[PDB]
Ligand binder design. Structure first.
Ligand SMILES: Cc1cc2nc3c(=O)[nH]c(=O)nc-3n(C[C@H](O)[C@H](O)[C@H](O)COP(=O)(O)OP(=O)(O)OC[C@H]3O[C@@H](n4cnc5c(N)ncnc54)[C@H](O)[C@@H]3O)c2cc1C
Ligand SMILES: Cc1cc2nc3c(=O)[nH]c(=O)nc-3n(C[C@H](O)[C@H](O)[C@H](O)COP(=O)(O)OP(=O)(O)OC[C@H]3O[C@@H](n4cnc5c(N)ncnc54)[C@H](O)[C@@H]3O)c2cc1C
Ligand SMILES: c1cc2c(ccn2CCC2CCNCC2)cc1-c1ncc(C2(N3CCCC3)CCCCC2)s1
Ligand SMILES: c1cc2c(ccn2CCC2CCNCC2)cc1-c1ncc(C2(N3CCCC3)CCCCC2)s1
Lengths: 492, 492
């Protein structure tokens, strides 16, 4: 009578929802959506709306913004602003509540989005894969827990997102991930964030701003240089500016064991023998694809070398009617890329207008302090796949920071081109504005903009972004993969 | 032999300096630049560096920045930052002192650039035309004053910018312009900016921040709506947000006379008949090209019916080898336009590649609070130019401001289109980050980007700029000049 579902979706995240909505309202398809919670927060943290809405994008930006105010208050003095210095208090409990109310607002809107949209229905619980055309809902992630639904499905979309990777050292239970950090009752006086990724960096600034008096945020990384994958000079610069803002950046170090002290603080021993006492130890060493609770062995879905789900240019798996999008694919773990993959999967299946999503030349940010903006390739990657590579550099200390009192806040801007046709292959910014600036740059790369298109554009003065139009000559080259300043005389 | 140059520049401003530097460092020409001061301030205000450096873009930017801190301190309470509100106060003298230092540093560096660059010589004095090939530098703007030098010039470039226009009302003596506003001893308790342009609006925000207790900023404009030439919706939103901050906006009002009071304050009487008692009256009703002291009649350089120096698309005047650029031409009074006009002039005259400054689709800004970023045409003009016009629009109060308490701060993001092909004709933004966002949008327009090229681009989450890659369907249309919420019929 009610049949199956033209599509069932496991995980109602960024991609899960964009697919179920573009199907119930765009194609009148029957759609089911399974997620494990309706409101943000413990015990599962991520809930209806995805990691982005509950324990990622939205709540992180709000907290970084709140953390920027530490700099604002300090820098106002240069512009003549005075107020009781010793009376300032960074009220973390107040910040978390403001955030929680923002998140729950989105939780309810989506909560209502399902209650007035025929063909779109929400099923609370855990989704496991039974047959190649049946999704199993259970009260908990345990495969032997009670069942509440068995959703007959014509198409099955896997969109469970990803999960924080934890290492195998003694005392790892005394550690937290990004998940639990959003819900600390109090701000930690001493915090150690492990790893070098954007999550560890972004939370180092947040903790650094709301820490009570006498606190130290120590970031450790097992290798030499943090923010692996981002442009090099931006990496060293960001390291320098994190230090300036009081964060201890402790590279070439790795926790080896963690114990509790008589007061509940964590005692951390490293692989190099050095010890550190902190009140919180946050692991941010990577995000793995979230596939364990899916029972993908019941149907034989294939996984890549990394624990991720294998897919093609259309998000299809070996099983004919099973697709995967979002962070479960282990590709570009970004929200708009999951929204793009989801929207594309639908109108290629339920709309016979096949259009895939482009994974190259994608804009992304890193709301650190200072923030990062990037798009395209970095210079050392362009080298390994491009004849002649040009690099445009420019690192001015912004206008206002001679007054502000923050001379260290050096704004950086790199452009990377194929020197043959001058086509821009990358753009890398560091400094306030980088996230908002890079967005419109993403459109340019989608239009094959050559460098001439940039410096021949009239600037908007005075801005930081004008520095992208002010670079007319390379600072060095990458020819044959090698880096020398000058570019040796032709010779074919 | 001596005092015979390749180029003589009257006015060491934005366009002038670019012209000379390029001519000397890029083509090894003997260059001479004349200006009336080496450092900012009275009695001449403008100086080496131009109006932008000494009494223009640079100084106001720093002061707007300082005024933004009034909002920052207030908005920080929503994010958990506590402190004695009553203890806050802004020190206007520290702001000016700080701004003076920053401007002075630029003055100091531009000098020494002359000292270290051969073929580039500076001449302190007042320049004017004696003959087609001779620039005279006198001790004062008066023709009767002492000659300092006579400079033989194969080419002369007029780059003296513009000057504040002051209406000839009785009591005008008791008023100031933007020039003197940069050097007030104390912040006015009561102030009246006159004019609906970007200078009056920007200063309203600065005075509104630094006014002592019980103050009141009052902006008046003789017409019904401020910021003519900007997108209407933005015009009306900025008006609301200005009122939302404390600035009172008197429209359809124009001062008729000013008189002194016993205490020494001002008594304004408008045409309509109303009266306002204010401590300062800042005129910003426009700026006229500074042709007064050049002796253009001695040579016959023709002026425009509007009052600027007449120049073709290559900046050539009716008189051979005499050129003009910048505000003196009375076109787009923007620093990068003059700079680009200067660099183009040098390439053409001293190179083997003609270059002319594209004056359309120039991205400009306006540093109100919040700011405006725009580029390209606005609805009305597009409707006069194209057949079918589409208008993509997006307006909301960012989530960060629902928390900060500043709920009036509604973001705006229009996009004008020619529906006959999709090419973006203009972009108009309002809110935090707009000036930075618009810069790369200027690159996209030079590439004739289409509306599809924006929404088919993957966005950066979470940012204000996302709203540009999110408008897919027009909010309304403009067919044959008329506005309508939907189109006509069929149209295969
Ligand atoms: C701290 C942090 C900051 C980030 N910041 C950014 C940023 O600034 N910009 C950006 O673009 N990206 C950011 N990301 C990444 C972004 O949030 C994710 O890439 C995005 O959520 C991916 O979309 P998705 O739908 O695939 O995953 P998700 O949105 O996480 O979808 C997974 C959902 O499925 C549910 N689920 C899981 N297993 C099951 C199951 N068995 N049964 C039922 N439901 C299940 C989960 O509870 C969750 O609701 C950030 C991530 C983190 C952790
Ligand atoms: C308050 C204000 C704010 C502004 N803000 C912005 C902004 O945010 N962005 C933007 O793009 N533009 C802005 N502008 C516009 C910008 O200042 C001018 O458009 C720009 O400086 C024009 O450059 P120019 O070289 O043509 O003239 P100027 O830069 O003004 O140069 C003219 C120079 O010639 C000198 N001079 C004059 N007469 C003589 C003479 N007889 N002999 C020798 N030297 C002489 C003057 O001393 C002056 O230094 C602003 C302008 C003002 C007034
Ligand atoms: C929000 C609230 C909604 C509905 C439908 C009903 N409601 C509220 C129910 C009412 C109940 C009574 N009280 C008032 C609210 C729909 C929404 C939507 N969010 C987002 C939507 C869109 N995607 C969905 C997933 C991310 C964004 C739809 C696709 C285009 C972008 C916005 S659509
Ligand atoms: C500043 C200081 C300079 C020079 C040349 C020498 N100085 C100082 C001398 C010392 C500098 C530090 N090293 C030791 C020598 C040149 C500059 C320049 N600013 C800006 C310049 C530019 N246009 C020139 C005219 C207006 C701005 C042209 C170069 C790119 C930035 C803009 S050029």
């Amino acid at each position: 009578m009610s049949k199956a579902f033209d599509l069932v979706v496991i995980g109602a995240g960024s991609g899960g929802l964009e697919a179920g909505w573009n199907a119930a309202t765009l194609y009148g398809k029957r759609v089911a959506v399974v997620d494990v919670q309706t409101s943000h927060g413990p015990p599962f943290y991520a809930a209806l709306g995805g990691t982005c809405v509950n324990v990622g994008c939205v709540p992180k930006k709000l907290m970084v913004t709140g953390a920027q105010y530490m700099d604002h208050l300090r820098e106002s003095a240069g512009f003549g602003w005075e107020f009781d210095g010793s009376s300032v208090k960074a009220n973390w409990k107040k910040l978390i509540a403001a955030k929680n109310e923002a998140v729950l607002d989105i939780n309810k809107s989506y909560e209502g989005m399902f209650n007035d949209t025929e063909g779109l229905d929400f099923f609370l619980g855990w989704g496991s894969l039974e047959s190649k055309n049946v999704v199993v809902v259970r009260e908990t992630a345990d495969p032997k827990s009670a069942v509440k639904e068995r959703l007959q499905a014509d198409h099955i979309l896997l969109a469970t997102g990803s999960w924080p990777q934890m290492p195998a050292i003694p005392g790892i239970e005394h550690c937290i991930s990004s998940n639990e950090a959003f819900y600390l009752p109090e701000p930690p006086r001493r915090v150690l964030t492990v790893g070098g990724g954007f999550i560890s960096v972004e939370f180092a600034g947040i903790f650094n701003a709301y820490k009570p008096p006498g606190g130290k945020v120590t970031l450790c990384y097992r290798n030499n240089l943090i923010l692996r994958g981002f442009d090099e000079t931006i990496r060293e610069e960001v390291t320098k500016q994190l230090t300036a803002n009081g964060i201890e950046i402790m590279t070439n170090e790795n926790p080896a064991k963690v114990s509790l002290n008589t007061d509940g603080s964590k005692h951390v021993t490293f692989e190099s023998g050095k010890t550190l006492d902190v009140d919180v130890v946050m692991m941010a060493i990577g995000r793995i694809p979230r596939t364990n609770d899916l029972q993908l062995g019941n149907v034989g879905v294939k996984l890549t070398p990394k624990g991720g789900v294998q897919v093609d240019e259309f998000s299809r798996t070996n099983v004919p009617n099973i697709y995967a999008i979002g962070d479960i694919t282990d590709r570009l773990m970004l929200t708009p890329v999951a929204i793009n993959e989801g929207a594309a999967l639908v109108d290629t299946v339920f709309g016979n207008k096949p259009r895939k999503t482009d994974h190259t030349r994608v804009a992304s940010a890193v709301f650190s302090i200072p923030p990062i903006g990037t798009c395209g390739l970095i210079e050392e990657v362009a080298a390994k796949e491009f004849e002649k590579v040009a690099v445009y550099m420019s690192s001015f200390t912004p206008l206002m920071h001679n007054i502000s009192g923050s001379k260290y806040k050096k704004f950086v801007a790199k452009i990377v081109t194929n020197h043959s046709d001058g086509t821009v292959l990358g753009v890398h910014l560091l400094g306030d504005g980088a996230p908002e600036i890079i967005q419109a740059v993403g459109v340019c790369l989608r239009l094959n903009a050559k460098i001439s298109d940039f410096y021949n554009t009239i600037g908007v003065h005075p801005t930081s972004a004008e520095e992208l139009c002010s670079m007319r000559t390379p600072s060095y080259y990458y020819v044959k993969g090698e880096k020398m300043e000058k570019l040796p005389d032709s010779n074919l």
